[PDB]
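Hi V.,

Quick status before I head out on leave. The structure for the redesign project is tokenized and pasted below; the design run finished overnight.
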């Protein structure tokens, strides 16, 4: 979508994309998260979080402990490349990140850090041309 992509989250605790590709010509990347469900953020809130695949579970665990006001992301967690807000049904959010944060040919994990969702809601992101 240039240097943008749109991802959908629903009431089934799913994302519609399992992988994202960042083009090499991009200096900035933008992700647009949409919550196409009708459930409340307290019940089935979704976010989109970018980490080294390695940091997935540790960031997820710390995020859970941060609470909803922190969007289920430990504040200033340095393992976090980018993340959106936690949204409810009918909402959306966008995050733009600096691509030079990514290392070519390395796979990254994107997941939802709302409590219990990282196990069902995850995908890979990589830089490719
Ligand atoms: Cu979620």
């Amino acid at each position: 979508a240039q240097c943008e992509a749109t991802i959908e989250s629903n009431d089934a605790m799913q994302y519609d994309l399992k992988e994202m590709v960042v083009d090499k010509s991009c200096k900035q990347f933008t992700v647009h998260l949409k919550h196409v469900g009708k459930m409340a953020k307290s019940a089935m809130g979704h976010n989109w979080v970018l980490t080294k695949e390695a940091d997935k579970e540790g960031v997820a665990t710390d995020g859970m402990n941060a609470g909803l006001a922190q969007d289920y992301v430990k504040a200033g967690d340095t393992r976090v490349i980018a993340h959106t807000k936690v949204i409810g049904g009918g909402e959306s959010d966008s995050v733009t990140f600096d691509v030079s944060k990514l290392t070519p040919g390395e796979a990254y994990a994107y997941f939802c850090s709302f409590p219990g969702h990282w196990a069902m809601m995850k995908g890979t992101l990589k830089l490719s041309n």
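Above is the designed sequence. Strands lie at 4-9, 19-23, 28-35, 49-52, 82-83, 92-98, 108-111, 122-128.

G. will cover questions while I'm gone.

Best,
W.
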